[PDB]
Amino acid sequence: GSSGSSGMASTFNPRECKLSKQEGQNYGFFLRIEKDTDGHLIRVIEEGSPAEKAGLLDGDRVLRINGVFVDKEEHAQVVELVRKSGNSVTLLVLDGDSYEKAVKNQVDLKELDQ
16 A cells, blocks of 8 residues: 655755766776775766766765665675666765764665655
């Protein structure tokens, strides 16, 4: 059963990303992780790359990948999705402050749908 809810609590302002690359070519960025760190880590952001153009910064946490909550998923679960995603991949990056306030208020982040 799909019942409609009434009375939202709070909602953050996530940043959407639209990456575009050719078949065989690379995006420019890579999905990495850091010890004792929440969310996903993004390092190796080449210059003038199609990955950064999407406001992609270092350490940026990708709430969901291609429109899929990848918080509990494994580094392998994401990377793969990014591939099947297609020529164009979407990513949702949240601000540190916001994220922190979320992980602290146990606020469902997966819900965040830009």
